[PDB]
Symmetry: C3
Subunit: 452 residues, 3 copies
């Protein structure tokens, strides 16, 4: 009776780069099949506008700020990671009988205690850092050359992939390999006779922009070189989703599986993505940076052919997956999301009269976002707080703060209140970022929460 759960996460997939969310040029039929026979979300938000903190939030069900994970891990490697006392959704499900697998991108710590096998994943196949070169014919020779030279700090994008701690020699284009291993996983799950949970973390369409010629050949009308490469990268994900769906059907798993497909953040416009109609992209507190595509699919439980128009947070997946699995959640875990299912079924706002936050730090100041009901408050580029009616003004073109003073001020002060239990960052993505953090007396919330 308890359903299987598949969380598919594309990396830097732009808002307009799947068909079901308005793509005019990239075609994603297998992903679209899941949308057409399920529900898509027009107001889905991640907890942070870039990779590491967004992913920390997905797994922990907590705003990354609450657990010191506001920054990506140090790009050249580290002995730190998402804190081990915050129980991952995989570990919870595993403790309630689920068979658990994770594939592809991790970027939440490479130490023994931060490794997927210790965060409640029985199976893991992928690469532990922030991304990876896509062609083994290219990356394996570079790693061979650097290792034989004696070097220990080798760029994590060319290191060998692993399976449960043992290295492997990958042969296929990485997107295809991860898809293949997703098939292998759900095939292994047939014999287990428990429900299963799969975290499928594709690196596509994250840099570097490397695509197969066979995928790029499907977009002859895309004249721009990078956009074409990107299109091929996304299509490879779509082929993967089709390959996984044929395997689920083969095993009679398809009907009792909740599939969630989403992005971890907004697309990067300078690396082939499109976020139409949203402003800006990756790393912004504008909508482009943390409003993402999402679909649910689960026959007879998730309504087919619908589009859910109320705010949903990536933080909601933790308690929602838990509720659907029959897993008790303790109050000592401090989950920032909500079980969105009661409100989803009744077609009501699961965050009625409640804020959804984004807060991205920069050098000496912070950009911020608040989404509640129809309203979107925006703090960006050291400007005064702006307010938009995001239902009417999705592109954030018309600041109506001047005629809503009390409402905006109230929203900012509630964020100010919310800020106090944010931990100091446990790391930064670069050594100079942490020096500057300390030099600038951060967080400079005097700037961030100043009002009229």
């Amino acid at each position: 009776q308890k359903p299987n759960i598949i969380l598919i996460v594309a990396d830097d997939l732009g808002y307009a780069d799947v068909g079901f969310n308005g793509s005019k040029d990239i075609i994603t039929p297998n992903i679209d099949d899941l949308a057409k026979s399920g529900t898509s979300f027009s107001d889905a938000y991640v907890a942070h506008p870039f990779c590491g903190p967004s992913r920390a939030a997905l797994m922990t069900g907590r705003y990354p700020h609450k657990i010191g994970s506001q920054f990506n891990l140090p790009t050249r490697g580290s002995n730190v990671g998402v804190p081990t006392d915050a129980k991952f959704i995989s570990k919870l499900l595993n403790e309630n009988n689920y068979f658990t697998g994770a594939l592809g991108k991790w970027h939440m710590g490479d130490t023994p205690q931060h490794h997927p096998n210790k965060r409640g994943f029985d199976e893991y196949y992928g690469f532990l850092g922030g991304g990876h070169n896509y062609f083994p014919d290219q990356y394996q020779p570079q790693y061979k050359k650097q290792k034989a030279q004696g070097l220990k700090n080798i760029f994590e994008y060319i290191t060998p992939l692993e399976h449960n701690g043992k290295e492997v020699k990958e042969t296929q284009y990485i997107t295809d390999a991860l898809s293949r291993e997703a098939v292998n996983f759900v095939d292994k799950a047939v014999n287990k006779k428990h429900p299963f949970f799969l975290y499928l973390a594709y690196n596509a369409p994250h840099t570097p922009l490397q695509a197969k010629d066979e995928d790029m050949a499907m977009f002859p009308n895309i004249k721009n070189k990078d956009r074409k490469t990107y299109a091929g990268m996304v299509y490879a994900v779509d082929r993967g989703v089709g390959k996984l769906v044929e395997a689920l059907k083969k095993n009679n798993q398809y009907d009792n599986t909740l599939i969630v497909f989403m992005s971890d953040n907004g697309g990067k416009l300078s690396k082939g993505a499109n976020n139409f109609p949203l402003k800006a992209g990756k790393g912004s507190t504008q909508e482009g940076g943390f409003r993402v595509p999402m679909l649910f699919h689960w026959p007879k439980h998730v309504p087919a052919g619908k589009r859910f128009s109320h705010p949903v947070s990536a933080l909601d997946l933790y308690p929602t997956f838990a509720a659907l699995a029959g897993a008790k959640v303790e109050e000592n875990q401090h989950l920032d999301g909500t079980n969105m299912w009661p409100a989803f079924i009744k077609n009501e706002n699961p965050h009625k009269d409640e804020p959804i936050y984004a807060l991205r730090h920069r050098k000496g100041y912070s950009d911020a976002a608040i989404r509640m009901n129809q309203w979107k408050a925006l703090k960006v580029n050291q400007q005064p707080w702006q307010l938009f009616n995001i239902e009417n003004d999705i592109s954030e073109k018309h600041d109506v703060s001047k005629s809503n003073k009390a409402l905006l001020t109230d929203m900012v002060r509630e964020m100010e209140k919310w800020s106090w239990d944010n931990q100091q960052p446990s790391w930064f993505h670069e050594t100079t970022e942490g020096v500057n953090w300390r030099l600038d007396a951060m967080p400079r919330f005097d700037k961030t929460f100043k009002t009229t």
Copy 2:
């Protein structure tokens, strides 16, 4: 095992009760408890303002040791006095006591920081730093703001609660809290365990709002604010009388230890008087953290006496624990002492031991050390001063120049004591925390410099 009542007035000045020298405000019911018990001429709180003082009372620890050196953010927060420091209420509750808290909290409004999770079976009051006194005034303002859609409403006008459910209060807040203190000790009769009551009045803290009937009792007080203040204190005294008539009615009075005190010194610009002490609220001068206190407990606490040796608010935790038969573990790191053995023998419970105060400011800190007859003072970025506080209670005569070695030794022991102070877990305003970080605080290089 005795019942225990800790009554705490908020910003009650040193000279604003009769038993501690008031010439103008009259407090007969409070004075009754003094007359038939023991008052304390050298009683000190752990910090010269509300939040950290109260954190210390409940935890038995200097607030600096647990990151609670500042009042909680004035516009609300998700933080509070850390949950791993067990409150005296929780300890007593685990040793069979029925536990109640009334009025002011100001130690965290989250589920895990709420009174019901800090070991209080009953709670009636308001969770923030204070409250407007008249429901006729505050409830319409809250109705208007709530219907407007606003979520960050000023905590002084929000509705009071009883164990997490809201209520619609009808009386002047001081009288309501007194009434609920009666209701509590009445509920305690049927329980047949001993009880503990934390009665945290907001009077005479701002705003200065008094009943006309109380102000009418001070026709000779010409100053408007002092009159209002006087009426506010008198309302507390009426409350204490109403509680005492209830204790007698239930035959609880004879087996109850009542402690009446202030959380800190009075604020001179808001109607208080701290005579004969210098300065007031927030100072490391005596005015800021030397407070009135009485114990009352028939046959156990001597009647009509005045105890002249130093006592700390930190002492109430282990002293209440000892009197209740509650074991205290060393892993708790209590900074106070069980003052009862020394109290009975009329000896100094802190003989040859310092009592500290340390209040932070913008880019520097003021400090105080009280040991035996001596009072060391660091204030206003001046050199350390020393006073013989037995002879010189008003701190008029700095005798540091002729006691160099002693002063230096005292400061160095404070310097030693400072190292396990945690970084603050919050500040009362966002700018205070920014400045803390900008100024590289604590600037203990200034605070512990000697010559």
Copy 3:
């Protein structure tokens, strides 16, 4: 079957100040006996180039940076110490049946929970601070005079020694007393019928430079006054080692005991030491500061008359002692060392293709060191990173970074990677050091890891 273990640690013993490690002037025959019938180490490194952090590392098996112990404890006293959640090697061995003793210098916290008896030492005899005056005839009168004056913050070098928390009145030159108590310990261990572990932490030859006339009389050819005093101090250690060895033989303990003799850091050149052929000394990331003498001795298990030429870290003693004792180590402990025994027996590098680090903080910047295989990277005096082939260039005279850019950069980046789990310091050795730490936004790893 399970061996006894003795860790003898001299304090600030210079690289060239024992015979077995090249001394031409100081003579140390009993120490040399252990070298001659065992193995010495030419490439032995401690975890930090000064006392407190080095010792924290020895006991915890962790780089002191990982546990907030990068600085010596506050010189005038404190309520902090090496964190209690990092299990000491003594506690581990004690939990696996060993009888445990510690002698002399502690300098890892003087509070109840940081005291030797709570860090897994059944027996303790010594002084809790960073050093001590050597002659009871001199120091006890000064302490008597200051205590009777009323002072509480008395210089830790003159305070009385203790035995398991009770004070004593020591009569002998401190080095001789500690040696005597080491005898007393191994005599007490005979009756126990378990294996034993002894941490013998001499303060010699740390300042102050105080020696017996009888020891100084053995070096008539040393014309320099301080070097002679120093020589006598080291000789007193050597007499102690002989006195301990005669006791081990008397009890038939000698043959089944692993004796490790080492220094906690490099010698201080301005206080009588010699670090030949190494550059600089105490507190430097040059070799002089953290490359130290070490010998192992254990008959039939440790090869006799050999000299091990591969890198060994003080961090290795924790897991190596554990493995030899049959004590399981959990991964949750985060040991930074390795069990060096498999590689030691095969005469292979126990840290093949693995770095050994040093990182000493200063005012506004940090000096650093990396030792891997033949290479030594050096960050000193705010200069660019240097690289030496330490096999060819032990004195660090010839920077070959200009022709090995990729290798140096790779080494620094691996240190940069390693730095991220370093905790903020939990204390500093002086109040102004911590203020400056905060003012200068430390750690300034932007300077420390620039390439």
